[PDB]
């Protein structure tokens, strides 16, 4: 049930019933954490960090091995992102569309797509304010958005 | 319609259905051990990899990400794990 698409997709991940780590896994809980730290110091998003561990080091689920989620591990060490990842990616998309739209006056479709992206930004911003992730004065402005990200 | 018992599906029935439509969800991906040529060190690679996998020892390109299952390089040897 996509918000802006009539079609209903079903492609998603399905976690196995088992929550135990495999026997072949030769990495310990401590060893995985420093790999997370090194990847973060390289400048990678937590979603991208999990992909790298899955592809090469055979880390199917970081939560099952270390007992903590990736973002919670990063916060403990102090490598906390300034802005939430999904919010930051959405703001990044809006700037790129707006930058293109200034050089193309007649692009009606880019104007229409810009409205939908801003609608998701406003909805997510209100939710994060409720969870107190953002201070209750943060606002999204088109001029400010470039400086934000 | 043909009669199917929801409690005890046959092994060929539950292997054919969608991974989300089974009685209990179970992914169709897996982990494998690959041995590159040039040096016989063993590397664990996810089947549906999305990033190029390089050997730790010799830095040879093992697999290339694709739409579905990752394609291995020629001459490699692979073993399903578990």
């Amino acid at each position: 049930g996509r918000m802006h698409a009539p079609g209903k997709g079903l492609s998603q991940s399905a976690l196995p019933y088992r929550r135990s780590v495999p026997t072949w896994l030769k990495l310990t809980s401590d060893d995985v954490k420093e790999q997370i730290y090194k990847l973060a110091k390289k400048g990678l998003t937590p979603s991208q960090i999990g992909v790298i561990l899955r592809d090469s080091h055979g880390v199917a689920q970081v939560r099952f091995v270390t007992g903590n989620k990736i973002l919670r591990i990063l916060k403990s060490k102090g490598l906390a992102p300034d802005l939430p990842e999904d919010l930051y990616h959405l703001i990044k998309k809006a700037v790129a569309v707006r930058k293109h739209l200034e050089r193309n006056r007649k692009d009606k479709d880019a104007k229409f797509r810009l409205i939908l992206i801003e609608s998701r930004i406003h909805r997510l911003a209100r939710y994060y304010k409720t969870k107190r992730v953002l201070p209750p004065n943060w606002k999204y402005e088109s001029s400010t958005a470039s400086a934000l990200v | 319609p043909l009669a199917k018992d929801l409690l005890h599906p046959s092994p060929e029935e539950e292997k054919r259905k969608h991974k989300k439509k089974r009685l209990v969800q179970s992914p169709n991906s897996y982990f494998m051990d690959v041995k590159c040529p040039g040096c016989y060190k063993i590397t664990t690679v996810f089947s549906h990899a999305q990033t190029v996998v390089l050997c730790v020892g010799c830095s040879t390109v093992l697999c290339q990400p694709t739409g579905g299952k990752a394609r291995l390089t020629e001459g490699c040897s692979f073993r399903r794990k578990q």
Partner: peptide, 27 residues
């Protein structure tokens, strides 16, 4: 394949995402 990955390094390797990336940049 290695060349194609190296061109993609610019997009996936961020320079201003984390908090510490800002504070040592100001130095």
């Amino acid at each position: 394949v290695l060349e194609r990955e190296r061109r993609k390094r610019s997009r996936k390797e961020l320079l201003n995402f984390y908090a510490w990336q800002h504070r040592e940049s100001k130095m």
